[PDB]
Design a protein around this ligand. Structure first.
Ligand SMILES: COCCNC(=O)Nc1cccc(Cl)c1
Length: 314
């Protein structure tokens, strides 16, 4: 943080967005996932800057140095996307390439759908683009696939917050792990009543993360907790209604889908038949890569993005 430039943008009277800036050239906006920070793109920030790009590694709403209102409604895709447009207006940017991972990936897909005039090119790590069905309920879709059982536990406000905020060191040591080191069962939750059951009181340090890196996520999450980041899940009824309003309109700006082979939550199989809605959709498959794409295989992520940006985003 000391060797990094920190930017702040007041998108709403009570909502302020934090971001780190490095490099010159076309604007590249990076959107992290859950329970992450701008620090998740630590290997991408100088790499994309050297390639000739103005990197904007965001601290998403409810995370780190950015504002965290307790209201659930403030974390729906409609208000989040509108805040990201205001962020571009206040920075004097007409266009920017939006690259998202996990929940940030969902945001970048919606941004390309509703505001294509502000999105130059779009890239998504692990997160697929699925058009919503107006006949099927959002809760029915979650209950259909057993892997998304953890989402039901994340619905009731305060329940997951108490477990995730309990021991932040234990929280990130159990979560930030490679798929071969993974001690978490996502389909076991709402039956056991907690995300960390198999994981012990003092979990071992993963090969992809150091003690210094783990403590950074602890101090950043000490500012607001988990209420803000968890509210991204609590708008499943609101996001579906907004996604159903687009029904018919397709993306037209260059797109990239990056899949992680060993990701058990956001499987590469979920991205199947995405080339029916397309529009330009280029692919990048990373073998022996877990959920934390940027942490697991940092070099392969840098190689895929730099190659894609210079050929479609410039
Ligand atoms: C766009 O959909 C994002 C959903 N993915 C999602 O929640 N994934 C997730 C990643 C790390 C830890 C936990 Cl508990 C969940």
């Amino acid at each position: 943080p000391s060797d990094m430039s920190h930017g702040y943008v007041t998108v709403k009277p009570r909502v302020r967005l934090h971001f780190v800036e490095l490099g010159s050239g076309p604007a590249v906006c990076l959107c992290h996932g859950f329970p992450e920070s701008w620090y998740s793109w630590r290997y991408q920030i100088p790499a994309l800057a050297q390639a000739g790009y103005r990197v904007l590694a965001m601290d998403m709403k409810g995370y780190g140095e950015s504002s965290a209102p307790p209201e659930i409604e403030e974390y729906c895709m409609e208000v989040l996307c509108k805040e990201m447009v205001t962020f571009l207006d206040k920075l004097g940017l007409s266009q920017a390439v939006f690259i998202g991972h996990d929940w940030g990936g969902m945001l970048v897909w919606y941004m390309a759908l509703f505001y294509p005039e502000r999105v130059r090119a779009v890239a998504s790590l692990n997160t697929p683009f699925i058009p919503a069905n107006p006949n099927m309920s959002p809760l029915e879709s979650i209950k259909a696939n057993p892997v998304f059982d953890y989402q039901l536990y994340f619905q009731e406000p305060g329940v997951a917050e108490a477990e995730l905020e309990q021991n932040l060191s234990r929280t990130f040591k159990s979560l930030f792990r490679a798929s071969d080191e993974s001690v978490l069962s996502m389909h076991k939750v709402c039956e056991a009543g907690g995300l960390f059951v198999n994981s012990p009181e003092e979990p071992s340090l993963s090969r992809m993360v150091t003690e210094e890196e783990i403590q950074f996520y602890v101090q950043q999450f000490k500012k607001s907790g988990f209420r803000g980041p968890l509210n991204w899940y609590r708008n499943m009824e609101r996001n579906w209604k907004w996604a159903c309003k687009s029904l018919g309109r397709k993306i037209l700006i260059p797109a990239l889908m990056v899949t992680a082979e060993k990701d058990f939550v956001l499987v590469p199989q979920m991205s199947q038949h995405m080339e029916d809605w397309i529009p330009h959709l280029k692919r990048g498959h990373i073998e022996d890569c877990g959920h934390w794409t940027q942490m697991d295989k940092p070099t392969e992520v840098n190689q895929i993005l730099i190659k894609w940006l210079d050929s479609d985003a410039r």
